């Protein structure tokens, strides 16, 4: 099996599981107290969540790749496949799709069918145009991909909480920096 | 009033209803003290609930008599006059009036404004008074301090000639005045935030500077 | 009998030097930093000494896969089950120092894709190829344990010494099982 | 824009209006949708939360108070839909139940409730050996032989575990029982990661119960 | 007519609304309109009295208090949230409360309150300002009240 | 003796023949594997200092590339959180190469690395060829500390090195708090039947 049944088997019997309502409640508590602390400056809240996600991903790149130990991704396709098909599966019960391939194979979008972080969420009316609620995921993806010498830019373009039906995260590779230790 | 928490219960509508009844009965009997006492509460705490009609009627009925008979001698809240910026302008060319200049190691790169004035030059005092209520009041005179006064106090003749300064209903209307400087300071960086004001012909009351939100707007001269 | 385990963070420099010999204590803490940094430098040297014959033609991407041992580990944290992994896995450092043979000890090195280095010194001198598989499986065991109890630690800066209590005792138990 | 608007007061809602502005939070049900995620994600979120909390705090007491405040809100939310959600007897689920669950009002019913259903819901297993020190006046305590959230935290100090203390405190505080919940480590029985959540009630509750 | 309010532990309303019968779309005429918050405040004391008492259900209290032809019914959630309703005649009657309908209405409104409380940004002190909440509450009143 | 809280990596880089080997004769524990410069490319020295009541270990890597070290010398800056650029004030070539060395460090070393400038063999005022003013001006534009060192003028490089480690510690130190009446008596069971 390439990646589907692999990640399925790992999540089936390799990992200790915990309830997700606790996860979304915890994340909601952090986000709400952060908005209270920062005095409703939701752009700064987005920046802080980005920093938090970056730290989490820099730490997280070991848990994945220690449980899986998959080889290094070659070019921009295997990385998307693994990242959307087992990387999210192992840590969460979600299998987002790939959509909007760019003309030159440099950008792709993670259509998040289910967002466990935003389970019971309804933004305040003064933040429906500014606050990316689940901004921790972009930081996690950015840091995690940077730690494998795959530096890229990750940003939301639409969310289910704000307007449009589908929520997607665009990932665009800037360059594969060659400081990737003496291997291969 | 003791039964609730006018001074365990946070039902503001019921509180203002009973307080309105209290002032009504306090006027029914000839008790001019508690009318002022509770009208002070009713237009300091529950100000964001009484709309145009209630505030206008209350100011016409219970406040102005409470001022004319000197029942209360203090302004309602201290959150007035948010900004007190002061400026001087060069009447002549820039060259005219200059402020005088007032006459082996180990390097590492790893480790508000103050205003200056002369005696004779003319200045400009601008203050942004605010009126959170739905009625209008008039400022009668403005003074700076006792300490930093006698140095740069506002011209009494100018404010007297200009007459009372009417503030619109919900405005942050500004007042621009001249200012006269007489005495020196040598080397002693004084501060200016006392700014006595009289509102509706009351005793001169102090008002400290409060910015947009609790931080104090302080400047040095 | 793996008598000593040490790990090098990402750029040289030592962060964990718990040893399980009875009583030698011959090397102070200071010399082991020099040993780890020298190992990193020798790894770098070994990367750039491939013979000319193999540089232009490898044709050897079938032997990199490490066969798995059933229960080399023991007899958990984020993991669950009787073992940390049942499947076979692949080698990452196909162009680097992999072991050092000596008549009195054998050193094994397992380099993470990120850059983490895990070094195991064993008194035992196996056909000198199966022992590579045993060492790689044990070192990925230790790497999984590190990813559990050293990475999910609020009070631990990145690539700094591992002053923790659960990680060291659990690797001590793990090496105690393997003998 | 006809939502309460408490400054104006109550509004006249004529009983002929069925015009419906979907909200995406009221339409969605809350039955018990199983979406269990990995423990690793919870652990990493928890440790990044504590890491962010280190820079903001100044002393141990402030750290503990802020962590307890973090868990307090989770307690606020969990009380309602752990008491309410258990009333289902095997669209909206309000018209699926004939009898609301009898809300506890005694000293030990709530503690039994937390021992049984809240801890099982949180960590997928019933808590162990709820006991009370029957010497002074009241020292009720919940003990866990191996806490889940803070298993990866090294050291013998219990400061990072005040999160669940705050959860319990908020739970009992809304339920009508103010508390002084605080954690202690009591290594005993061969586990040695054994933590005891001492619970101390207020004099008001003691007067009310008797 | 009917007057409904949701009040927290600190004795403050987080939601208030009044319902009519659609043949007299004016509510309580002028005096009970002013007296409604005070009578509800008075009845809250009896509701708190029944909050801690043994003797089945204890969340739905039914008719607890009485006034000048006004029936007062109370329901209590698990977080001490008090749901209070004041039923008024059609200018002449002896008001009788429908037990099952009032019970079901309080159940569904408690569902609404709990799923309002769940989101991160809500606080216990703050009021329930939401057009969706008011809309679903009033169509619920049509469904269950009368 | 694994008591040091932090391990900082510092690289002592400079032109060949400048006199780096004598420069790191002071801040050392003069023991352990001597030489090894020509074998792998680096020699190792260590220092222990307390900053803000926290032990810090600093490891010094005095790399040099003569004819063989093209890629390895680059790889040796994998995570250096400090650099100690060296030039001699005798010949302008060593000072001229400082920009090239700094370019390599900022291109390859750790991001936002604290890097300084050392002027060695300053006692020899006979053959001076680089003035202090020019060196200081070059340091100003590139965010570096600068000093001059000599055998007669010793104990200055030690203070500069401690100051560099202090500058590093104020940048890569996450704030922390010192995390340091339990119930006693026989309990009674209260779990439900
Ligand atoms: C090829 O180069 C390998 C790519 C490795 C992908 C790693 C992605 C792991 C992170 C996924 C997101 C998990 C969310 C966790 C939320 C706390």
Swiss-Prot record, chain A:
Matching Gene3D superfamilies: Trafficking protein particle complex subunit 3 (3.30.1380.20)
Cellular component aspect of the GO annotation: cis-Golgi network membrane; cytosol; endoplasmic reticulum; phagophore assembly site; TRAPP complex; TRAPPI protein complex; TRAPPII protein complex; TRAPPIII protein complex
Compartmental location: Golgi apparatus, cis-Golgi network; Endoplasmic reticulum; Preautophagosomal structure
Coiled coil location: none
Keyword flag Transport: yes
Lipid attachment in record (S-palmitoyl cysteine): 73
Annotated Pfam families: TRAPP (PF04051)
Gene Ontology biological-process entries: cellular response to nitrogen starvation; cytoplasm to vacuole targeting by the Cvt pathway; endoplasmic reticulum to Golgi vesicle-mediated transport; intra-Golgi vesicle-mediated transport; macroautophagy; retrograde transport, endosome to Golgi
Entry keyword set: Autophagy, Endoplasmic reticulum, ER-Golgi transport, Golgi apparatus, Lipoprotein, Palmitate, Transport
General remark: Present with 2370 molecules/cell in log phase SD medium.
Family stated for the protein in its record: Belongs to the TRAPP small subunits family. BET3 subfamily.
Functional summary from the UniProt entry: Component of the TRAPP I, TRAPP II and TRAPP III complexes which act as guanine nucleotide exchange factors (GEF) for YPT1. TRAPP I plays a key role in the late stages of endoplasmic reticulum to Golgi traffic. TRAPP II plays a role in intra-Golgi transport. TRAPP III plays a role in autophagosome formation. Required for sporulation. Has a role late in meiosis following DNA replication.
PANTHER family: TRAFFICKING PROTEIN PARTICLE COMPLEX SUBUNIT 3
From Swiss-Prot, chain B:
Subunit relationships: Part of the multisubunit TRAPP (transport protein particle) II complex composed of BET3, BET5, TRS20, TRS23, TRS31, TRS33, TRS65, TRS120 and TRS130. Interacts directly with TRS65.
Higher taxonomy: Eukaryota, Fungi, Dikarya, Ascomycota, Saccharomycotina
Protein family: Belongs to the TRS120 family.
Extra facts: Present with 259 molecules/cell in log phase SD medium.
Protein name (database record): Trafficking protein particle complex II-specific subunit 120
Gene: TRS120
Location in the cell: Golgi apparatus, cis-Golgi network
Transmembrane annotation, as ranges: none
Stretch of the intact protein here: 562 to 841 of 1289
Function field: Specific subunit of the TRAPP II complex, a highly conserved vesicle tethering complex that functions in the late Golgi as a guanine nucleotide exchanger (GEF) for the Golgi YPT1 GTPase. TRS120 plays a role in the YPT GEF activity of TRAPP II in concert with the two other TRAPP II-specific subunits TRS65 and TRS130.
Organism of this sequence: Saccharomyces cerevisiae (strain ATCC 204508 / S288c) (Baker's yeast)
Curated annotation (Swiss-Prot), chain D:
One of the record's GO cellular component terms: TRAPPII protein complex
Annotated S-S bridges: none
Keyword Transport part of the UniProt annotation: yes
Gene Ontology terms describing biological process: endoplasmic reticulum to Golgi vesicle-mediated transport; intra-Golgi vesicle-mediated transport; macroautophagy; retrograde transport, endosome to Golgi
Coarse class of the protein's main subcellular location: Golgi
Subcellular location(s) of the protein: Golgi apparatus, cis-Golgi network; Endoplasmic reticulum; Preautophagosomal structure
InterPro entries for the chain: NO_sig/Golgi_transp_ligand-bd, TRAPP-I_su5, TRAPP_component
Domain of life, source organism: Eukaryota
Record's keyword terms, sorted: Autophagy, Endoplasmic reticulum, ER-Golgi transport, Golgi apparatus, Transport
Sections of the chain in a coiled coil: none
Protein function: Component of the TRAPP I, TRAPP II and TRAPP III complexes which act as guanine nucleotide exchange factors (GEF) for YPT1. TRAPP I plays a key role in the late stages of endoplasmic reticulum to Golgi traffic. TRAPP II plays a role in intra-Golgi transport. TRAPP III plays a role in autophagosome formation.
Stated family: Belongs to the TRAPP small subunits family. BET3 subfamily.
Note: Present with 8350 molecules/cell in log phase SD medium.
Protein name: Trafficking protein particle complex subunit 31
Originating organism: Saccharomyces cerevisiae (strain ATCC 204508 / S288c) (Baker's yeast)
From Swiss-Prot, chain E:
Subunit details: Part of the multisubunit TRAPP (transport protein particle) I complex composed of BET3, BET5, TRS20, TRS23, TRS31 and TRS33. Part of the multisubunit TRAPP (transport protein particle) II complex composed of BET3, BET5, TRS20, TRS23, TRS31, TRS33, TRS65, TRS85, TRS120 and TRS130. Part of the multisubunit TRAPP (transport protein particle) III complex composed of BET3, BET5, TRS20, TRS23, TRS31, TRS33 and TRS85.
GO cellular component annotations of the record: cytoplasm; cytosol; endoplasmic reticulum; nucleus; phagophore assembly site; TRAPP complex; TRAPPI protein complex; TRAPPII protein complex
InterPro entries: Longin-like_dom_sf, Sedlin
GO biological process, one term: endoplasmic reticulum to Golgi vesicle-mediated transport
Domain of life: Eukaryota
UniProt xrefs under PANTHER family: TRAFFICKING PROTEIN PARTICLE COMPLEX SUBUNIT 2
The UniProt record lists the keyword Protease: no
Family: Belongs to the TRAPP small subunits family. Sedlin subfamily.
Purpose: Component of the TRAPP I, TRAPP II and TRAPP III complexes which act as guanine nucleotide exchange factors (GEF) for YPT1. TRAPP I plays a key role in the late stages of endoplasmic reticulum to Golgi traffic. TRAPP II plays a role in intra-Golgi transport. TRAPP III plays a role in autophagosome formation.
Subcellular location: Golgi apparatus, cis-Golgi network; Endoplasmic reticulum; Preautophagosomal structure
Keyword set, alphabetical order: Autophagy, Endoplasmic reticulum, ER-Golgi transport, Golgi apparatus, Transport
Keyword Transcription attributed: no
Cystine bridges: none
């Amino acid at each position: 099996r390439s990646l589907k049944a692999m990640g399925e088997e790992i999540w089936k019997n390799k990992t200790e599981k915990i309830n997700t309502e606790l996860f979304t409640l915890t994340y909601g508590s952090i986000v709400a107290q952060l908005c209270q602390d920062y005095e409703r400056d939701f752009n700064k809240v987005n920046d802080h969540l980005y920093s938090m996600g970056y730290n989490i991903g820099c730490r997280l790149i070991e848990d994945f790749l220690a449980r899986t130990a998959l080889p290094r991704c070659e070019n921009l396709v295997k990385t998307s496949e693994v990242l959307s098909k087992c990387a999210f599966k192992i840590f969460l019960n979600i299998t987002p799709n790939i959509t909007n391939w760019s003309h030159n194979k440099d950008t792709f979008s993670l259509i998040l069918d289910e967002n466990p972080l935003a389970d019971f969420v309804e933004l305040p009316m003064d933040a429906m145009k500014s606050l990316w609620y689940s901004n921790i995921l972009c930081g996690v993806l950015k840091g995690s991909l940077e730690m494998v010498q795959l530096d890229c830019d990750v940003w939301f373009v639409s969310d289910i909480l704000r307007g449009d039906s589908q929520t997607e995260i665009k990932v665009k590779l800037n360059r594969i920096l060659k400081d990737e230790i003496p291997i291969g | 009033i003791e039964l609730l928490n006018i001074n365990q219960s946070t039902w503001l509508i019921l509180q203002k209803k009973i307080l309105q009844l209290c002032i009504k009965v306090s006027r029914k009997i000839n008790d001019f003290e508690y009318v002022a006492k509770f009208s002070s509460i009713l237009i300091t705490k529950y100000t964001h609930l009484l709309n145009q009609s209630e505030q206008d009627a209350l100011f016409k009925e219970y406040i102005q008599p409470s001022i004319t008979n000197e029942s209360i001698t203090s302004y309602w809240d201290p959150f007035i006059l948010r900004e007190v910026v002061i400026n001087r302008i060069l009447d002549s060319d820039p060259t005219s009036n200059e402020i005088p200049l007032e006459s082996q190691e180990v390097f590492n790169p790893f480790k508000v404004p103050i205003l200056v004035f002369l005696v004779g030059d003319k200045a400009e005092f601008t203050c942004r008074v605010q009126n959170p209520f739905k009625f209008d009041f008039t400022i009668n005179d403005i003074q700076l301090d006792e300490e930093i006064s006698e140095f740069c106090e506002i011209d009494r003749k100018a404010v007297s000639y200009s007459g009372p300064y009417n503030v619109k209903a919900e405005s942050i209307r500004s007042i621009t005045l001249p200012l006269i400087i007489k005495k020196p300071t040598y080397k002693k960086i004084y501060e200016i935030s006392c700014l006595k004001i009289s509102i509706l012909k009351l005793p001169l009351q102090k008002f400290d500077i409060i910015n947009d939100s609790c931080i104090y707007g302080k400047l040095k001269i | 009998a793996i008598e000593t385990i040490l790990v090098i963070n990402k750029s040289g420099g030592l962060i964990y030097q718990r040893n399980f010999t009875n009583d030698e204590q011959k090397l102070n803490s200071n010399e082991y930093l020099i040993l780890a940094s020298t190992l990193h430098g020798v790894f770098a040297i070994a990367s750039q000494l491939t013979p000319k014959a193999l540089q232009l033609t490898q044709q050897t991407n079938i032997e990199n896969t490490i066969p798995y041992i059933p229960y080399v580990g023991m007899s958990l944290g984020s993991f669950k089950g009787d073992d940390f992994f049942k499947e076979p896995f692949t080698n990452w450092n196909k162009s680097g120092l992999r072991q050092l043979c000596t008549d009195q000890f054998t050193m094994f090195i397992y380099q993470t894709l990120t850059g983490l280095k895990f070094v195991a010194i064993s008194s035992s001198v196996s056909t000198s190829n199966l022992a590579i598989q045993i060492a790689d499986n044990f070192l990925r065991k230790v790497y999984c344990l590190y990813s559990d109890y050293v990475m999910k630690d609020p009070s631990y800066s990145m690539e700094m010494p591992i002053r923790s209590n659960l990680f060291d005792e659990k690797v001590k138990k793990m090496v105690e099982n393997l003998q | 824009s006809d939502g309460y608007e408490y400054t104006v007061g109550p509004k006249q809602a004529i009983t002929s209006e069925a015009s419906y502005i979907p909200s995406r939070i009221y339409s969605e049900s809350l039955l018990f949708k199983r979406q269990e995620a990995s423990l690793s994600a919870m652990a990493f979120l928890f440790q990044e939360m504590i890491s962010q909390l280190h820079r903001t705090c100044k002393t141990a007491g402030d750290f503990e108070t802020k962590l307890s405040d973090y868990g307090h809100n989770i307690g606020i939310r969990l009380l309602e839909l752990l008491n309410f959600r258990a009333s289902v007897s095997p669209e909206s689920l309000s018209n699926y139940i004939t009898k609301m669950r009898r809300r506890d009002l005694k000293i030990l019913d709530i503690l039994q409730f937390i021992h049984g259903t809240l801890w099982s819901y949180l960590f997928n297993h019933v808590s162990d050996d709820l006991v009370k020190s029957s010497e002074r006046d009241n020292e009720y305590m919940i003990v866990d032989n191996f806490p889940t959230l803070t298993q990866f935290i090294p050291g013998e100090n219990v400061s990072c575990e005040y999160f669940v203390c705050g959860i319990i405190k908020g739970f009992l505080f809304n339920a009508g029982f103010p508390c002084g919940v605080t954690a202690h480590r009591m290594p005993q029985g061969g586990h040695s990661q054994r933590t005891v959540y001492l619970i101390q009630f207020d004099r008001q509750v003691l007067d009310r119960e008797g | 007519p009917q007057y409904f309010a949701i009040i927290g532990k600190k004795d403050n309303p987080v939601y208030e609304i009044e319902f009519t019968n659609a043949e007299n779309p004016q509510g309580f005429p002028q005096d009970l309109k002013e007296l409604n918050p005070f009578i509800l405040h008075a009845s809250l004391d009896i509701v708190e009295d029944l909050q801690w008492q043994i003797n089945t259900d204890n969340c739905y209290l039914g008719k607890v208090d009485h006034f000048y032809g006004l029936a007062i019914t109370a329901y209590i959630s698990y977080s001490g949230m008090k749901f209070v309703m004041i039923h008024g005649n059609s200018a002449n009657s002896s008001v009788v409360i429908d037990d099952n309908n009032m019970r079901s209405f309080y159940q569904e409104v408690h569902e609404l309150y709990v799923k309002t409380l769940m989101n991160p940004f809500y606080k216990i002190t703050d009021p329930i300002r939401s057009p969706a909440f008011d809309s679903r509450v009033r169509t619920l009143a049509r469904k269950h009240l009368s | 003796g694994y008591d040091y809280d932090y391990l900082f990596k510092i690289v002592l880089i400079g032109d060949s023949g400048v006199g780096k080997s004598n420069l790191l004769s002071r801040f050392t524990t003069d023991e352990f594997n001597i030489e090894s410069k020509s074998t792998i490319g680096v020699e190792f020295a260590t220092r222990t200092i307390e900053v803000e009541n926290k032990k810090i270990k600093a490891q010094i890597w005095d790399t040099a590339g003569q004819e063989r070290y093209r890629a390895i010398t680059s790889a040796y800056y994998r995570g250096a959180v400090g650099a100690l650029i060296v030039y001699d004030i005798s010949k302008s070539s060593s000072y001229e190469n400082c920009n090239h060395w700094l370019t390599e460090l900022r291109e390859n070393a750790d991001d936002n690395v604290a890097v300084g400038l050392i002027g060695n063999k300053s006692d020899l005022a006979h053959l001076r060829a680089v003035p202090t003013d020019e060196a200081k001006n070059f340091a100003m534009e590139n965010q570096m500390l600068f000093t001059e060192t000599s055998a007669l003028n010793s104990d200055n490089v030690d203070k500069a090195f401690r100051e560099l480690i202090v500058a590093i510690f104020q940048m890569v130190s996450k704030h922390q708090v010192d995390l340091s009446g339990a119930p006693k008596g026989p309990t009674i069971s209260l779990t439900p039947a």
